[PDB]
Design a protein around this nucleic acid. Structure first.
Ligand SMILES: Cc1cc2c(cc1C)N(C[C@H](O)[C@H](O)[C@H](O)COP(=O)(O)OP(=O)(O)OC[C@H]1O[C@@H](n3cnc4c(N)ncnc43)[C@H](O)[C@@H]1O)c1[nH]c(=O)[nH]c(=O)c1N2
Length: 452
DNA sequence: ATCGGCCGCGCA
DNA sequence: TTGCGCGAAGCCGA
């Protein structure tokens, strides 16, 4: 393994016991540098490797759509791990509290977790640290260049981070060895229970049936390898030319799998790299999954206030400030956006794309989040409604890519200042009629007319 | 250091 | 549509 992928969190005396992988972000058995590290420590010490996943009450902030998708990654994940003789364990509480009992109860010798830059991970890791005595390592298994190696500061834009990332790519772009089975030796209720809890929160139509359409993405590692091979085979060619057209389904549709870590961006990079197609389609796509996926981690990692106004750049702050008294063409309430009740049929279309499938089209997500800022009473409230719907309804929500994507839209983070306007100040504008030069907007509204 | 280099619109 | 040149606009890093 490339050692630079490892951070030592807590130093102590290596217990005699097993290596416990605390599985958080990267819920996969293959192409996992974290579990590949745990097994190596279990191997040298001739102790086993084991997985422990912590199911927290944060699922009740989202909905059936995400929770189902995730606890079927997990059922399949466990069949896979047992097949390698690595048993997995599923605790049901506060990680800081619960993971600390596990290591102590089970005489864990060494504890490993994967890397995530979101605030709450830090709260737990710091609680685990103060309650264990065995060593404690962290591994970046979600990025190609470990987040703290690509850059040590917040990067102002993609084109300041782009040299830094490619500087280090030949070293960190590499094949994955093979997860070696152990030598040394309930998820059904958990879902049935979680679901009954979330059942009065489903989005229904006027009729009783749910809004969500569960057949657009199958969850799992197996599914995610076919979404990836499908993209490489059918859409990667057309990607640069049609990535921006909401009527063509020419995206990878990989974001829900990456979010849960059911597939590794590094594998995807490897396979796109090796694959022949339009060299511009490969360049266009590699920038999305290398430069934009990883500066988004860079973002939350250096900006603890990443989901708030205070992390916008200074120019963006001043400008939105001076336009807090400008009169707004419309003001909608959370619940009115929520049910696509604006005058803008394009907006409502895209909101209807969000509610029924769980994945709104890449381009339409920009447009969507800017009209929230233009038609709400203040930036804080627009940031609030946009996080809220993003995380409530996007399969790929509750994710750095989310906070970094909203802050681009509403705040100009990783963007630049544009022609000053009312309400939106110097923040990049996007117009209806600009969409109309770009794609048959009429076809996209026809698609989603379930506003009942 | 001193400057290059990161959507909407008019038009053919 | 479809590409091009332009506009308005602040800031990083050679
Ligand atoms: C308003 C709004 C809200 C969000 C986001 C953007 C915007 C404008 N993003 C990011 C982005 O829109 C999203 O990653 C893409 O729709 C990914 O879909 P595909 O994988 O189908 O795209 P596509 O195949 O074109 O991109 C491939 C991969 O590159 C990365 N990438 C592409 N666009 C990116 C972007 N704008 N920012 C960062 N990485 C990007 C993603 O990992 C994506 O899976 C996000 N993403 C997410 O996973 N969860 C979220 O909740 C949000 N929230």
């Amino acid at each position: 393994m490339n050692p630079k992928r490892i951070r030592a969190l807590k130093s102590g005396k290596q217990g005699d016991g097993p290596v416990v992988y605390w599985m958080s972000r990267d819920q996969r058995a293959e192409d996992n540098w974290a579990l590949l590290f745990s097994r190596a420590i279990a191997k040298e010490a001739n102790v086993p490797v084991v997985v422990v996943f912590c199911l927290t009450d944060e699922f009740l902030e989202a909905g059936i759509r995400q929770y189902e998708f995730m606890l079927k990654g997990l059922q399949e994940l466990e069949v896979s791990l047992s097949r390698k003789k690595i048993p997995s364990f599923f605790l049901r509480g506060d990680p800081g509290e619960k993971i600390s009992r596990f290591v102590k109860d089970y005489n864990a010798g060494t504890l490993v977790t994967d890397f995530s830059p979101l605030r709450i991970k830090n709260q737990w890791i710091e609680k685990v640290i103060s309650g264990i005595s065995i060593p404690f390592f962290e591994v970046d298994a979600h990025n190609v260049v470990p987040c703290w190696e690509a850059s040590q500061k917040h990067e102002y834009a993609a084109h300041t981070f782009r040299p830094k990332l490619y500087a280090l790519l030949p070293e960190f772009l590499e094949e994955f060895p093979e997860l070696e089975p152990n030598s040394v030796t309930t998820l059904s209720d958990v879902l049935e229970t979680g679901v009954k809890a979330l059942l009065p929160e489903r989005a229904l139509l006027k009729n009783k049936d749910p809004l969500f359409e569960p057949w657009h993405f199958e969850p799992g590692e197996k599914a995610a390898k076919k979404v990836m091979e499908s993209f490489i085979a059918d859409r990667l060619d057309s990607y640069g030319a049609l990535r921006n057209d909401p009527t063509k389904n020419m995206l990878s549709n990989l974001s829900p799998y990456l979010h849960f870590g059911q597939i590794s961006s590094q594998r995807v990079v490897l396979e796109v790299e090796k694959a022949e197609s339009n060299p511009g389609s490969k360049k266009a796509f590699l920038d999305e999954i290398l430069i934009w996926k990883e500066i988004s981690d860079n973002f939350c990692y250096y900006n603890p206030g990443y989901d708030g106004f205070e992390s916008f750049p200074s120019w963006a702050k001043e400008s939105l400030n001076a336009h807090r008294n400008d009169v707004r063409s419309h003001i909608y309430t959370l619940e009115e956006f929520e049910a696509g009740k604006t005058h803008d049929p394009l907006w409502n279309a895209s909101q209807m794309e969000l509610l029924s499938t769980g994945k709104m089209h890449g381009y339409m997500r920009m447009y969507w989040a800017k009209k929230i800022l233009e038609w709400s009473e203040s930036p804080e409230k627009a940031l609030e409604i946009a996080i809220c719907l993003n995380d409530r309804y996007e399969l790929d929500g509750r994710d750095p890519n989310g906070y970094a994507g909203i802050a681009w839209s509403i705040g100009g983070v990783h963007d630049r200042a544009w022609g000053e306007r009312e309400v939106t100040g110097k923040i990049r504008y996007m117009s209806y009629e600009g969409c109309k030069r770009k794609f048959d907007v009429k076809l996209y509204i026809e698609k989603y007319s379930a506003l009942d």
